[PDB]
Ligand binder design. Structure first.
Ligand SMILES: COc1ccc(C(=O)NCCCCCCCCO[C@@]2(C(=O)O)C[C@@H](O)[C@@H](O)[C@@H]([C@@H](CO)O[C@@]3(C(=O)O)C[C@@H](O)[C@@H](O)[C@@H]([C@H](O)CO)O3)O2)cc1
Ligand SMILES: Nc1ccn([C@@H]2O[C@H](COP(=O)(O)O)[C@@H](O)[C@H]2O)c(=O)n1
Ligand SMILES: O=C(O)[C@@]1(O)C[C@@H](O)[C@@H](O)[C@@H]([C@H](O)CO)O1
Ligand SMILES: [Cl-]
Length: 322
């Protein structure tokens, strides 16, 4: 069925439930067996390069996997297995250079409008229930009473930045723009939870904070923090889409999966070309395509094929406890 080289992918519980077909472990030192129809790798991680080369030489297509957008309770870097994966037979969502399976799903407007009730239900649970990709962080504590601008940091070796046509230099450009364009505001630079855990680095290690430019190094749930801000600047973070769900304006310095559909203030030099390729989409079309069609889910108790709604309910149940 599907060949898996990576031992890290192979150990994902219920891998075959996400892929919807049988899977088998392959060795880098043996030929591709005839019974394998496609090879699955993790996005454009460095670990994917050898299996991608082998697939090309063997005449086999590549499927790219990654975490879903509502993934788990604890962080991926803390060894928590995923409850959702993305499955991409074309490219991968974060690679802006060519269409992905997700881009094509977004463009199928009719298939997305069919899902409008499920989209509205899940959107409401995510925002008002304060859910995200990772779900263990407590809510941010603050007075609910319009002068705060959020600048989102990411992880230094994450491929969404690179394949979104960006790198460390766009993080500096983003911060400088947030400062200059909002001279009366406080600028909050939010550090990524993987970096707060000590497992990864970010893009602002050298930043000298000031009275106006502050570091947010508390691990807090995104929707709770978004209630306290007036607008959001990103390079390629998933936070940008979560900020759209929260009703905030979003400025993008990279080319993430949700840029160039008409819903974001796009700053990248390739924005016009990408917008021409993508066209327009509504927020609910983007949400249905990504969260309901592109992402696949398993049941957190039985392991069987599931849906977003079941995963959300479980994650809310586990939170009350924890
Ligand atoms: C004969 O000489 C010879 C033979 C072989 C070699 C050689 O090259 N050997 C090494 C082969 C490659 C070893 C790969 C180790 C396992 C990596 O597992 C994964 C992967 O990349 O496939 C499994 C995935 O499910 C992920 O966990 C990824 C990680 C790291 O690559 O990706 C991220 C992460 O950075 O943490 C990416 C994120 O976007 C996110 O998905 C997170 C996730 O939440 C979990 O943390 O994974 O590892 C030489 C010589
Ligand atoms: N600075 C950041 C960036 C991301 N995040 C979290 O990490 C998830 C994934 O975002 P990235 O695409 O930035 O890795 C977000 O959904 C959110 O839970 C955060 O909480 N603070
Ligand atoms: O490490 C990566 O390649 C990155 C890819 C992103 O789309 C996203 O998955 C990100 C993680 O959220 C980091 O925890 O990592
Ligand atoms: Cl760079």
């Amino acid at each position: 069925g599907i060949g898996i080289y990576s031992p890290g992918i192979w150990r994902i519980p219920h891998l075959e439930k996400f892929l919807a077909q049988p899977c088998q472990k392959l060795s880098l030192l043996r030929p591709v067996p005839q019974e394998v129809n496609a090879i699955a790798v993790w996005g454009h991680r460095p670990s994917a390069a050898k299996p991608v080369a082998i697939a090309k030489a063997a005449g086999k297509p590549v499927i790219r996997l990654e975490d879903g957008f509502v993934r788990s309770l604890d962080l991926g870097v803390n060894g928590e297995p995923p409850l959702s994966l993305v499955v991409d037979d074309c490219g991968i969502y974060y690679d802006a250079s060519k269409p992905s399976a997700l881009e094509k799903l977004v463009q199928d407007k009719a298939g997305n409008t069919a899902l409008i009730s499920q989209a509205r239900e899940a959107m409401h649970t995510i925002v008002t229930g304060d859910m995200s990709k990772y779900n263990l962080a407590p809510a941010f504590v603050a007075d609910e009473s319009t002068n705060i601008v959020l600048v989102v940091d990411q992880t230094f070796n994450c491929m969404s930045v690179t394949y979104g046509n960006a790198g460390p230099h766009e993080f500096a450009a983003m911060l400088e723009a947030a400062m200059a364009e909002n001279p009366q505001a406080e600028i909050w630079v939010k550090v990524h939870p993987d970096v707060l855990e000590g497992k990864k680095t970010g893009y602002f290690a050298d930043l000298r904070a000031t009275q106006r430019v502050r570091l947010i190094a508390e691990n807090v749930s995104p929707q709770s923090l978004l209630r306290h801000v007036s607008r959001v600047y990103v390079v390629t973070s998933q936070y940008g889409f979560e900020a759209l769900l929260a009703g905030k304006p979003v400025t993008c310095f990279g080319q993430p999966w949700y840029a160039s559909w008409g819903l974001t203030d796009d700053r990248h030099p390739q924005s016009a070309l990408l917008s021409a390729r993508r066209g327009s989409a509504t927020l609910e079309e983007l949400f249905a395509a990504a969260y309901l069609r592109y992402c696949r889910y398993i049941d957190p108790q039985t392991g069987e094929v599931s849906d977003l709604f079941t995963v959300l309910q479980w994650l809310q149940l586990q939170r009350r406890h924890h």
